[PDB]
Every structure is written in structure tokens, then in C-alpha cells.
Ligand binder design. Sequence first.
Ligand SMILES: Nc1nc2c(ncn2[C@H]2C[C@H](O)[C@@H](COP(=O)(O)OP(=O)(O)OP(=O)(O)O)O2)c(=O)[nH]1
Ligand SMILES: Nc1nc2c(ncn2[C@H]2C[C@H](O)[C@@H](COP(=O)(O)OP(=O)(O)OP(=O)(O)O)O2)c(=O)[nH]1
Ligand SMILES: Nc1nc2c(ncn2[C@H]2C[C@H](O)[C@@H](COP(=O)(O)OP(=O)(O)OP(=O)(O)O)O2)c(=O)[nH]1
Ligand SMILES: Nc1ccn([C@H]2C[C@H](O)[C@@H](COP(=O)(O)OP(=O)(O)OP(=O)(O)O)O2)c(=O)n1
Lengths: 481, 484, 481, 481
Amino acid sequence: DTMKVINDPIHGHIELHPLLVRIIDTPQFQRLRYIKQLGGGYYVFPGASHNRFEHSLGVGYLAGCLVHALGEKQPELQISERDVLCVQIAGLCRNLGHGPFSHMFDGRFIPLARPEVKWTHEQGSVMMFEHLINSNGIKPVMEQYGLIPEEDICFIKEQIVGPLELWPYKGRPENKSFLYEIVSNKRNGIDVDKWDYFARDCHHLGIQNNFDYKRFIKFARVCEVDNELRICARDKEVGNLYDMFHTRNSLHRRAYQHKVGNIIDTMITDAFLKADDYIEITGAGGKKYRISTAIDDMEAYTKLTDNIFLEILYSTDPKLKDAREILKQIEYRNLFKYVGETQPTGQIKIKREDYESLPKEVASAKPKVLLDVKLKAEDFIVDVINMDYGMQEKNPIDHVSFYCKTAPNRAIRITKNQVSQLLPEKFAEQLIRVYCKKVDRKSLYAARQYFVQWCADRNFTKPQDGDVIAPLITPQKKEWN
Amino acid sequence: DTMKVINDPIHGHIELHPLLVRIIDTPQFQRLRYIKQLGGGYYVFPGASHNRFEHSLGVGYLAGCLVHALGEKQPELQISERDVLCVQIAGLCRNLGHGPFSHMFDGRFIPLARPEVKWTHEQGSVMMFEHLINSNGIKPVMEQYGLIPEEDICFIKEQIVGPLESPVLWPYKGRPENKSFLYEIVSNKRNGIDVDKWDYFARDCHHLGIQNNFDYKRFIKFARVCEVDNELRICARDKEVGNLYDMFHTRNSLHRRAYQHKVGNIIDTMITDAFLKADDYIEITGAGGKKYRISTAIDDMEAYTKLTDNIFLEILYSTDPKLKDAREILKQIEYRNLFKYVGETQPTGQIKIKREDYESLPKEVASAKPKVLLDVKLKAEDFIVDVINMDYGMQEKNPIDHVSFYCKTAPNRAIRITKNQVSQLLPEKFAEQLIRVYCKKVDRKSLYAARQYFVQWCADRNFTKPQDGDVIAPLITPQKKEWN
Amino acid sequence: DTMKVINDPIHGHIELHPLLVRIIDTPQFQRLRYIKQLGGGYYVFPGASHNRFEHSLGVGYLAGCLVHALGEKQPELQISERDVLCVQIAGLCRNLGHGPFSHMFDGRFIPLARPEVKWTHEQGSVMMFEHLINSNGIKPVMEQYGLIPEEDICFIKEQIVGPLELWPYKGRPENKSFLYEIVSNKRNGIDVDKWDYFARDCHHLGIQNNFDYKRFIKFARVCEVDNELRICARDKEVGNLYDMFHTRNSLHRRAYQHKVGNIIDTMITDAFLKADDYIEITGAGGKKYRISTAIDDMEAYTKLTDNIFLEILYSTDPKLKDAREILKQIEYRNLFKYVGETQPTGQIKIKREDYESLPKEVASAKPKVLLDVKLKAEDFIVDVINMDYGMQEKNPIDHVSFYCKTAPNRAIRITKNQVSQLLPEKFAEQLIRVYCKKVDRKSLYAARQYFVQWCADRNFTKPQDGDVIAPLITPQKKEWN
Amino acid sequence: DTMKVINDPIHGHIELHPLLVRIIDTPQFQRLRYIKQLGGGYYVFPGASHNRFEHSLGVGYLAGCLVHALGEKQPELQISERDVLCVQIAGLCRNLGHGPFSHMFDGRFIPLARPEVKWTHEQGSVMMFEHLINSNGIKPVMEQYGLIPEEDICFIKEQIVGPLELWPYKGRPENKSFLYEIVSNKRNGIDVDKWDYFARDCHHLGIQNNFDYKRFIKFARVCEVDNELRICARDKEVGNLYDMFHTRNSLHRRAYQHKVGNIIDTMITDAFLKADDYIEITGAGGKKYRISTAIDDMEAYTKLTDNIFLEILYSTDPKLKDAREILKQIEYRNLFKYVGETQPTGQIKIKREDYESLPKEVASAKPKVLLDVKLKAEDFIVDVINMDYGMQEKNPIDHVSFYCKTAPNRAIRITKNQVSQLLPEKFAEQLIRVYCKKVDRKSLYAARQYFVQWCADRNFTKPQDGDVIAPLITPQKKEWN
Ligand SMILES: Nc1nc2c(ncn2[C@H]2C[C@H](O)[C@@H](COP(=O)(O)OP(=O)(O)OP(=O)(O)O)O2)c(=O)[nH]1
Ligand SMILES: Nc1nc2c(ncn2[C@H]2C[C@H](O)[C@@H](COP(=O)(O)OP(=O)(O)OP(=O)(O)O)O2)c(=O)[nH]1
Ligand SMILES: Nc1nc2c(ncn2[C@H]2C[C@H](O)[C@@H](COP(=O)(O)OP(=O)(O)OP(=O)(O)O)O2)c(=O)[nH]1
Ligand SMILES: Nc1ccn([C@H]2C[C@H](O)[C@@H](COP(=O)(O)OP(=O)(O)OP(=O)(O)O)O2)c(=O)n1
């Protein structure tokens, strides 16, 4: 076994250590070739055909680039070849837990199918990783290349999911704290996973990426911060860091929360819910699982990919007829219709436990206009989207440490007002999208009247096309003019 | 209803006329989202995730660009909105006939499963198109936007597959000779210079991570229609001739580096093998509920609509013991336990290997008598021999001899340009064959032996010396004076 | 004369009508080959070798694209071939008035050399254009291609500089008002000039452009707004427009106001000031002009380019010795030293009339640190930079008209709160950079103490590296601690 | 002194060791900012504004990349930090000897101005390098960073110009032979200089580069070949090497030998020749030199750049009137007119000693056509261009060593027939361009008749537009019909 070279359109020629090759060449990893990175986004942006497999390679490559760069500038950190490989493996493997259509699965489907469970792709990635190791005899190979499985497997998992329960980590001591900031940075979100998806998603979507990760790496150093060794950025890069999160938010607005990409994800989720009683996935010992339960058996989950969509679409079983019809409407582009978008005002914050009551509220609005049709709660979809800088209401830059050119070993803090007055004043907001399942002209007209009346009643912002779609409704609200 | 805009990473914002939207929003078209452009190439080049759906949009877009550019520069050609839409539709629809893993299916699988049949993706595209039209009520929509279905449907099909009759005089019925140039946009049967190549060069390069050297926008800017032997044809500006030679050089480089990558091909081969073993057991429901097989879905478009890369996963995920052998081949692909590459050679002199002799080649390799001590003996069945025909699209011919040009001083006068009027640094031949050999036995001793047989066979047949011949078979290469 | 094709790395193959070729092939236009787009920025970003010539071709090309696209989508606007040519010519010609090192010349040099005069490159462009036309016999050529010189020359100039004093324009009537929004958009700054420089500057700087001008063009329409036909954007695109200005501000921060690029512009300006009495430029009738007076004669200004730098550097005249020495310090990279950056707080706004008093204030500060050297006012440079979204304190998106998909001919307004709470709360700010002309270690240390003490006294923001560069000074300021 | 980072649009963030910074920050190196890479090509391709300075940084960066990659893969080579710096410096400095408009100067001007001398930019680079070192106190700085000036300066020069005088090199012994193949590869032309110019020229010209230099670097190894350690490429990569030279030949054809770029170089050369007696350049000890003699004094040569073009163009001295007129014709685009192109046939090879007799031959042709004007020898320019793969008639790939995956330490040879029958059969050819100095319509018509008659008489290839430009002439030649 020697190193392999793979050619990636984002990163060029990437070298893979033979241990990494061994991990990659498994059913558990190769599974990621059948899971689209952007889910239903490929149905809106046709270049977004990329899958989680190639993203994962990229994350593993970049994790190696950052850790190598720190070691090379700062030999006194004692980064070992062992550390490098562990960080690469965590990078390669942090997407293992994703399900069909990526965020559709853990963002929409599992919360509706299994409301009692607390499932994340992160937790999935740990479980899949364990299963990958054990199923494929990876521990001896790890030993062969100088890893110590007990500690190092723990380290890899902690890099992916955080502490498995004072210094809370067991895989590495505080001396090496900075290593936990590479793959999945729990402190402020600045990690190599974002850097790959910014570049890769842009390349495929046909939108241009403004964040320069190579620059960031060149300016990164490790410094002591409150008795931990942490990654610090050069002071003057602070503007580029705000820009990084601004770029993330733009990509969410333009692509990852595109109103039609989201409705396609919703329709696919609906098909999956209707198919859940009838599709069977064979797991360990031949036992059968369903779409919603494959998360309980990694051998079954290994076989749970975007293929489920085609299995439903191509089915002839009359039990799958309702599921199959929904997917057929997607092929004909007979989609649920977008009604509009609004946002809460003031200190109003809509909680997850109130989401279900929203279609009911919309249908209870009493727009004072003549309507041909009356719509009911079940005719409406209301999608609430939390947009933020990765840390709820907090500014992630308040949780970044910097250094200055005159004293590169001294960590400092930089506040928002030390950077620019042109920066955001808030770091979290909610968008509310409404759609109608009745697609005819009269229903849609009515849906608009209810929607805008509901915005008015709730004191939400005026939809951008409010005056055009509901001219008789918007005058009543003085706050809108 | 109205135009749609689609954002494409290669071409940017592309506008689609509502008739084109209606054709796209059908099961027959959307099917192409589940067929990888490069087949098994994705298993070597991880960026090559792209599918035939997006390539088709690009071909439809570029077809519109070229036809529109000609109409704007030369109003006297009388290109109508109707002509534009027909050319866009042919562009959009010329990939409809591709099967699972694209060229794997019609290049390897169908020729082995149905040796008696003559199937091409082109023919498949015509049949799928007819089925798409009829199944989705497209004729009335065509009429609504000014098309005349009888003549225009014919035109579109002729653009994809060529003349629908044997002519052995103007062979086309969809459009008359005064519009002949319209047949050179989507699929150019005269010299291969068409918008389909231009999309795939750009798109494949973008995904593969290899850079594209051909500038199609430049070509379009310099293109004109001129009278050539009583036909109106597309002519390029004289001084672009070097760029045209370069276009075909680029196509060949892409074939060498990517589309005929030795491992991409062996993965296509292993997938084809799995499909062959699964063929008796997978059932695909077609028209009237009839069941078809992978190898027979080509006979029913309703079944073919449901035949995509999904077959690979249906096999891989199966539990039926009847699919065990097929499933086991695909599992070897996931573990990367692939057949091993032994080497590559080429014929010399006038030697040209015919398709009818392909099956006899593994037997010849196993019959070689390398004078070396061998711990294992290998048999015919242990070898795969892959013969690849590399050319400039027209067998032994120079396609540039079939291009018409114009000069700046007389833009309406068509001329010819020969190779010697361009450069002595250009290729002296336009076709060749590569021969790759692989071993199904992957252990160290088998592979060493496979190498001795292979190189001895090259020597016996008077093929070229493999590049690593002296290293892999040091005791064999000395015997051949021509190599030394 | 037929159309020429030029290959541009940003826009690809651009077609030039023969009238345009005629305008380009003149000493007045070709001059722009010898004026770097980013001035002293090339001395920081080595890829930024591009000149105003090629930018100008790109602006002309894009002005033609926008006007052609509007005409094709909306024939009812009656856009003529004549209109298209006039808009292209304005596009081609709006950079003719730039001087050596572009914004150095009209931003630093002329305001110091000719404080009494009110010079802008826009005015320069009109004067140069007039000279170009008259010197080269262009009027008959214009007539030959269907233009009417009296009106059309007026139109072109108005596009570049605005009204040459209700409807204030004479070159075209109100039914063509939208034509005035292409080349230099005085209403809200959304014009094709920015779209070319974003793309071209980024290509050359090695920074990625996030604004998609082709998308904008596809979504642009003309609609009636308060009895004028104006260019309107699709409502959906409002986020992309905020992003456009956010990109402009990023490019200013990273590149166009780079602290070292600015100080190189400042040093070149200093050399020019010291050479001004001795360099002679021959203008009309053999009269001699100076660098500072060449703006009064277009024939002399035609010969005023970046070459002046080399003429000074290569001179042997002892009268040019002091000028020549400054330029030689640039070659050895013995540059004035950056001390730091701060910003005013509260409602404090520094007025132009107070700029000259600032170095004095810095030198009057009384740090509370033992200093080897004492610095004087003349040792300090204070650069005050006004960063905004192109319209002072105003939000340019409040001056943009939009349309909705349901009524494409009805113009509407969209407020900031209808878009996002994550957008800027203010649209203008000031940055203050200080440099020291004494470059030795002890002078620099001292300069830092004065600088930070001055920040404290004035209640400016704490410099990002304040605690490192002036540890004994920052503790006194409770607001910083 | 610490490392500087510089952002390049081709290579991204490049790190420069402080010794390199010291060499860069000199009048001798900064000079290269005033010399366009592609000479007159900027007058055809407006994006080609780039200068030799930024190309030189890139060549220095890539030279470091290759040497570092070899050292990392093969520690047994004992590549030192010292070796790396020397190779970087040779890379940085190999373009120092270029003159105004790059290849114009040593390709056209010096051969005509100083026919008795033998000048190359390579020689110029060694002389300029020596001058740079001596004039700027660089030897002590080299010692400060561990170089040994005697042997290392010799090494750097040998890398640029080859042996200064069995192992012919003194700067390094045979066990480091491979180091001589990085910066200017005398054996087969595969060096980092090409790799930078391919990427950079393409970026600027707006043509796409198809050679992947990073791939090449990843597959490169050092192996023993005939008792020397040489760089070997992986066998597989042989097609990509033929493609590299094919790319080089395409770039020459499209860009570097563009027929109008060449005539602009020729017109600038003509202006320089006419100005040569009058322009004075001050060198060492105040001595005055001319454009043609500045090559004899490095202090004067330091001041010899593209600025000489503008100094002529802006001059008022009646002595410079003829020179100035030629440059003015360039601004008006009144260029010498292209008549056509042809090639010799068979084994016919035109020798340099016969170049001057060619315009006479053209004017002596007797086309049997009625002509208004008669042309003379002095009205014709005949430009003979030798196009090849860098080694005259030879195939450079016959001088490349390869290795195979099964024995990575064993060097091998690969012949053309082992690669492909679709490759070139010859590796050198000549193009002949003819132009007319009389630009009126009747002269040009006549020039075309003479030209095509001359092609017929000499048995050259039929010009591509022959039948259109000379319809009465081409019928006489049965070989063409
Ligand atoms: N480059 C870029 N592309 C975008 C952006 N938003 C959407 N796209 C792409 C995704 C699609 O391929 C295409 C059209 O998306 P749009 O959102 O304009 O179309 P959609 O039908 O969703 O809007 P509409 O029906 O007009 O309300 O444009 C953006 O902000 N930038
Ligand atoms: N992309 C590309 N650009 C080229 C090529 N050759 C030249 N160009 C660029 C350089 C110029 O900016 C522009 C026009 O060059 P041409 O050689 O087509 O024009 P020229 O006037 O020399 O030819 P003509 O007067 O038509 O014989 O195109 C090429 O092969 N590829
Ligand atoms: N890509 C990118 N390049 C930048 C940015 N800011 C500056 N550059 C370029 C300009 C230079 O070629 C190179 C280094 O510039 P820097 O501003 O980092 O160095 P400078 O010496 O000004 O700062 P220092 O002395 O470290 O405080 O990077 C940026 O935000 N993005
Ligand atoms: N007639 C020419 C020859 C060269 N060049 C430019 C294009 C390349 O960017 C560079 C190549 O020549 P250099 O002097 O930089 O180096 P070489 O002469 O060594 O190039 P090569 O080795 O490829 O012959 O010069 C040019 O514009 N015109």
C-alpha cells in the first residue's frame, strides 16, 4: 500500500495516505456517492449534481492542510504524524451520518417521523464510523501506521460530535486543544468543513465564492488562551471573518433555502412519510427496517440513500401509490405553490412547538374580500427558517482569538465596534414562507389574501409584493402605509 | 406560460422558452438526472458527478446561440422563430436515448447482451422523443407556439439521427436545401463540429478538474453561412483553421486522459458483467404491465424511461440469492478489489484489429509462451483485452478536409484549406487503436505471470513495446531486436 | 470599415462597431494604456497591472449589453441603433479624464497642488472627449453612421457628467430617461462601470467577485416611476443588490484603500509636488504646462500619464533630486510606516476643513511613557477615509425601484426591514489611518504611543492592536476596559 | 526581517523569505515592473498588460515548489535550505536581462542596431544579477541566511545561463545535477519558467491553459541516469508532456507570433532605430549611453525600459520627429499592412543570411496582371518565423527520462511510437509573413499580386486566401489546382 493521488476539481491533486484509502474503500464510505450534497437543490440548480462523497474527500484534504501548516510554522506544538492522520480521518468521516437528500432527512423527515428522538447527522456519523471500523478490520491497519485505536478512535469521534459526556475531552490533552478546532469547531464555527462546501457548492451552483481559506491558513497560529492552546487568526483578517459568515448567509438565502428547493424537499419528505410503512430495508441478521428506523441499525442505514426516491418512483405496488404520485408531481413540476415570505417583528420569536399551529392560524384569518373558494389548514404549508451566524443570537467573532504582528504569541480579542459600523446589528432572524397545496388560480388568489391578512394580524413584515398580490388588504395596516 | 431562467455553472443564466419547459418537465426528460455523463469515470474522477440532464440543457442552449447568431448576422437566410425552436428542441433532446452509465450501456452492455441487434443512443433518442411527445400532449403545445408538428417533428428527428430513409439528391424532408446549414448545428454528420461537443468539453472539464482549450464563443463569432456546391453551409473564418485542428486534438486528449482512463474502463466492464449476471432476474414494467429485462427495455420506451443508474443500486442492495453473483461483482467495486491492469500496446504497420476478432484475443494472450519460470499458469478467462479505436471522428479521414472556410476580403465566398496550408506539426494519421490488457487474478504471482504472457504476446504479434516493458518483463524484451 | 472583434479576459469576444474603433484609435483614448487602474495598488498586488484602457473597453461593452437586452425584451421603448451607439460611446469614454495613477491624481495630488480648483475625472472626461472629437474629425464619421452630433454629443457628455447645468437633460427626452442609468447612474450608483471593475479588478487582484451582473441584466426591466421610465430590478434580486454594495465596500477595504497602497500613492504624490516646478509639458501652440496645470490644456493632458513617474525616477537634473529621492525610497521599500487605524465614535464626524489640523493634534498628545525621540506634526500623516455605499449616509436601495412577477410593469419600493435584520444599520463611516515619516525603530515606537494616546483623548475606537503596541496607554481608558 | 506574503492571481498566497524580499526590493529587480511580458502583444490582446516583474515572482515561487516537493519525497537527496534559496533566487532572477518590450528588444532591435554583437536576455540576466548583488550589499545578507556567496552566486548564474566555461558545473556537484533542471532546463526545456508563463499569459490573454504543472510536480522523482541524478517523470505522464509542447506551439501561433503583434514590434523597433542617435541614457560615472549601447553598462541598462516608447512619443525635438511619427501611426492604427503568409515546401529551409534578400525577391516577381502602381523592395517586409518544440528539429521527449510504478528508482526511455501515431512527424517548421509599407488600396492590391506570384515562383504553399486575393495568379499553378 502506497499513497494515492486523486484529482478534485476544487483542490486539484490530493494525496491520500494508504490508511485513508482503506477507510474510503468501504461500503460505509462509498455510500456517500449516492447522497446529493444539496438535496432538492439539484432540482433548482442543475449543476448541483455533487454528492457527499467528494465533499468528504475535500474536508479530509483541508483538515490535513491546516494541521500540516500549523506544525510547520510551530514545531514547538509537537504535532505528530499520528495527530495529522487522526485529524484527516475525522475530516473524511464527519459526513458519514447524512441520510437521503442530506438536510432533508435530518431537517424535515426524521423530526416528523420520529418526533421523540434527538437525531443529528453528527451522531449518525459517529455510529456509522464505529460500524465502518468494526465491519472492515480497520483497527489493525491503524496500528500498522502508528495509531493507538483506544485513544485515537475516541479522538476522532470527539472531533466529530464533541465531548462524549474542567477539560472535557479524553482523546487529546489540553496541550493539543487546537486540534479540536479544525474539523468541527464547536466554539465559533470556523472550520474546514465550511471551507470545502463554500468552494465546492459555488463551483457547482454557478455562484462565485468570496472566502479565501488559503489566506486564512497562511495567517493562522496557535497561541495560549485561558490556559488552552487555541488557533488564532491575524488581527487584520477580522474583516475577512465577518465576510465568511456573510457568505455563508448568502448561500443559505440564494441556494440552500431557495423557496422551491425547500418545497421539493418538503414534497419528497411527504412521499417518504407515505412510503414509510411499506419500504423495507434489510439490516443486520436479515431483520427488516423502515426508512424511519434504519437509523437504529447501521447495516440498514448503509443502504439508505437517494435511491429510495427512485425505488418509490419506479414502484408498481398499489400500497406505494400515494407516495409514488407525489414524486410524479415533482417530475411534471406540479409543485405546491409559493404564496410568499414574511418575518416576525420586535422580540417575537416562533418556537418549534408552535410550528404545527401555523397553517391553522393562516386559514383562520378573515381577509375582508370576496372569495370564490374557502381554504382549510391542510391546504397550507408554513415553513419557518432560522437564519443566523451559527451561534443563535451571538456574534461568532466574539469567540475568535487574534494575534498582532508585533507579538505573534499574544492572543487578543476584537469587538464589533473596533471593526466597522457597516456590520450587522443582529446575528439571528427568522423567515416564514407560506405555500398552498391547491394550485389552481382561484385558490392561489385566496391563499394570498389569507396570507397577507395573517401577516397584518400577527404584525409581521409586509411581504415584498404585498401591494400587488393583496391590494385590498395592505391599506388597512398603517405601519405598512 | 412564460420563459424560465436557469442558472448553469458552464453557461450562466440560460433562458428557456415555455415550450422547451414543457418538454423538460416530463418523466422522459427528467430521467436524464439519473444517468451519469461519464459512467464509471465518476469512480476515478470524483468531481464527475454530472448527469445527462444538465448536459442536455447546455446543448439546447448552445444550439440556440449558434442559430440566433447566424440569423442576426445574415437576415437574408430567413431563419424563423420556428426554426430556432426546432433546433433548440433537437439540441435538448439528442441525449434522450442514453442508458445506464451512458457509453457503458451502448458501448459494452448491449453489444454483449443483444449481439444480433443494432442499437445506438441516437436511435434511442428518436424513439424516446416520439414517446415523450405522445405521452405528454406536446403536439397541441407546439401548435400553440407556431410549430407545424408533421414537418417539424420530422425535422427534429432528422437533426438527431440524420436522414430517416436510404437515399442511394437532397435526402431530408423536414427542411429544404436553402436551410441545410440548420442540420450542422446539433449533430454534424459531415465533419463532427457541433454544439454537443462544445458543451461536453466545457462541462466535462469543469467537473473533471482538467482545463478546456477550445473557445466555442470565438467560433460562433466567426461563423457564417455560404453557398457550397449548391447548398447553404456553415463556414468558419480561414484563420480559425488552427483552432479547429486544436478542437479535435482536445477531444482526443480528453478521451486519453479521462473517457478511456484504464481504470474507468475496467469499472464500466465490471458493472457490465454485473448487469449481464442480473439480466435474467431484474424486471422492468413497461407498456400494458408487460415485464422487460435490462437487455430488452430498449424495445419499450415506457420501460426504458425507468432504466437508469438506479439499476446499479437495485443490484447492490438486493437480497435475492438469484442476484448474488451480480451483487458480489458490485461489492468488489466498493472494496476496490478491481481487475488488475497489465499494460497497453498498439498494432503496427497496416495491422487493424476487427470487432469480430475481439473475443479471440484473451485466448491468444494465454497461448503465449514466455520463456520464464512461472509459479502459476493463467487461462484465457483470466484475461480481459480491451481494444479502443481513437480517431478524429471520421475513421481514417481528416475532418478539416470537410470544413468550408471564408476569407476577410470575400466573406460570401467559400474555400477549402488543406493540411499543408496550415502546419507540418499536425498529425500524419487520424486514427489508431489502443489495446489494454487486464488480469482477473489479482494476487502478486498471477500479476507477474500476466505481465510475462502479455509482453510475449506483444512480441509475437509485432505490437509496440509497452512503455514499462523492460521493467515488467526484463527477460522477455531482449528477444525482440526491433525493440532494441 | 467593418466591425472588429477584441478578445478580453473578462468578457471574451467583444464586437466593436467601426465608429467605436475610430474613437479608440486616437492619442486621447490610447493614452489610457499608460494609466494603471488601481494606481499604487500594483505595488501591493502584483497582478494589478491593468490599465484604464482595457477597463474602458469593458465598460463600453457592458453598456451595449444592457441597452441591447432592454431593447430586445421591451420593443415598446423604441431604443434605436443610434441610442445603442451613444450609450456605448459614453461607456467607452467615461474614464478619459483620469490622470497618472488614477485616483491618486484627483484624490490626492490635484487637491494639494490646486486647492482652489474643483477638478474631477468626470469633468476631465468631458473635456478630453470634446478634444478627442475635434482633434480627430469624428463628427463626420458620426454622421456617416446616423448620429446627429449636436444632440448626441450632448447626450454622451450628459451620460458622463450629468446635466450640463423639471426634466434637466437635453440629449434625450423623459421617455428615454432609463438610458441615463446605464453608464453612470447618479440616482443610486448601479451602473455598468462598477460591474466591469468588480470583475476585472478581482481577476487581477486575485480576490473573488461575488456579484453576478449577467443575472442582473436578465432580470432588469423598464417601468414607469413618477412619470419617468426607469430601470427596475426584480423584487427577488433585492438581496443581491445589497450584496453588490457590500462587495464594493469589501474591495475598498481589502484593496483600493489598502494601507500600503495608500501610502505609496501618498509618496508618489509627494514626489510629484516636488517635481511640479521643473517638469514641463508642451501643450497647444507650444505653450508649456506643469503636472498641476496640464488639466487646463487637453493637448498637454493627453501627454500626462504614469510615465511622469519614470521621467522623475530616471532624471539627472539636480533640480529633480528631492523628487527623485522619494521615488527611489519606494524602490528600496523604505516607505512611510503605518502606525495604526481607528474610527470616530458616537455622532462624531470629521470635516474636511479639520484634516490639516490632525497631524498637529497627534504630535500634541502626552502619552505617559518614556520616549527617546520627540516627534513633530510634520512627522505624521493622518489619512481620513470616508467609506460608504456611494450616497453618503443614505441607503442606495431606497432609491431603487423593483417589480414583481405578477405585475411586471408595476414599479414598487422595498424597505430594509422587508429584506433582513442582518443588514447594515448605517451606510457611512470614517477610517483614520496614521503613518510616521520617521521609519527607525524608536520613532515608530514613539509614534505608536502618541497615536494611541490621541485615540484615547478624542474618544476614538481602540485600535485592534492597541494593547500590544501601547500597553502602558490603553489601561487608562475605562471604556476600552 | 520576516517572511512576506504576496497575493498573486495565478498562484494565490506566495511566501517570500526575507533574503528574497531583499533582492526584490532593488532598482534592478523593480525595473521589471516597466517591461511588458508580451511586448507588442498588449496592442492586440488588451488583457496582456502584465509585466516581467510578476512573472519573475511566479517563476521563483514555482522553482521553490518543485525543489521542496523533491526534497519531501526523497530525503536521501540531501536537499538543504541553502539549495532551496539558491534555486528560488535563480528563478526570481532569470528574467532580469530583458529589455524594452521583452522579445522585441533582443529578437529584433539589438540584431539590427548591433549586428556585430551576440546578446541574449540570459547573458543580460547574469550581468544584471551581478550588478544587483554588488550595488545593494546582498553578499552579507546571503551570509546572514547561511549561503556561501562564492559558490552560491556561481550556482545561481549557472542555473540561468548554463556552464560559464566531464561535469561542466562548479556551483554544485553531480549528486545535485537535478537542481539544474528546475529553472532553465537546457536538456529538454521542461522548466518552471514555462509553467508560470503558460498560466499567467493565458489568464491575461483570455485563452485557456491546458497544461497541469502541479500534476507534473506530484509525479516527479529523481533517479540515476548515466551516473547523474536527474529529474524523471512518471511514464504515464508522457502524453501530458507532448501536450505541454503542443500548448507552447499554440500560444506562439495565436498570441506570441500574432501577425499584428509582430508588425507592432517591428514598427516600435523602427522608431527605436531612428531615435537611437538622440536618446541619452546616463550610466556609470555619468557617461552617456544610447538605447543600443545601454547593454554595455548595467547602471544604464537599469534605466532602459518601456518608458523609452513614451519618451519618444512625447518628444518635441525635431531630431526625434521621424521616430515620433512612427509611434504616432501606431496610435492611429495606421499600421504596415499584412499581405499574407506562406511556408516553404519539401526540404527547403531559409537561412538567416538570406532574410534580407527576400523583400527584393518579392518586388522582382512578375505577376501578369494590370497594376496601377509598381512596388519596390523597400515597400515590403518579409518576416521569417521558426516554430519548433524548443530544440530545433529534435523531439524533446527523446531527452526526458521516465520511471514506472513497479520500479520507481529505475529510469527509462519512451519513444514516439510507444505513445501515439497521432503525434507530430516533424518538430520544426518556418512561417513566412509578408507586409506592405504602402497602405493605400491600390498598393495593397498590387502587393498581393506580387506576393502570390512569388509564392508560385518559389514553390511555397498556396496562401489560404490566395484564390480570393489573387484570382488571376493562382490558376497558373497546377500544384495548387
Ligand atoms: N447566480 C444566482 N443564481 C440564482 C440565485 N437565486 C436563484 N438562482 C438560480 C437558481 C435557478 O437555476 C435559477 C432561477 O432561480 P429563481 O429563484 O430566479 O427562479 P424561480 O422560479 O425560483 O423564481 P420565480 O418563479 O421567478 O419567482 O437561478 C442567485 O441569487 N444567484
Ligand atoms: N481566444 C482567442 N483569441 C484570439 C486568437 N487569435 C487572436 N485572438 C484575439 C486577439 C485580439 O484581441 C482579437 C482579434 O484577433 P484576430 O487575429 O481575430 O484579428 P485580426 O484583425 O488580427 O484579424 P483580421 O483583421 O480579421 O485578419 O482576438 C485565438 O486563437 N483565440
Ligand atoms: N486575497 C486577499 N489578498 C489580500 C487581502 N489583503 C491584502 N491582500 C494581498 C495584498 C498583498 O499582495 C498580500 C499581503 O498583504 P497584507 O495586507 O497581508 O500585508 P501587509 O504587509 O500590508 O500587512 P502587515 O505588514 O502584515 O501588517 O496580500 C485580502 O483581504 N485578500
Ligand atoms: N516572440 C516571442 C517570444 C517570447 N515571448 C514571450 C512569451 C512567453 O511568456 C515568454 C517566453 O520567453 P522567455 O524569454 O520568457 O523565456 P524563453 O525564451 O526561455 O521561452 P522558451 O524557453 O519557452 O523558448 O516570452 C513573446 O511575447 N514573443
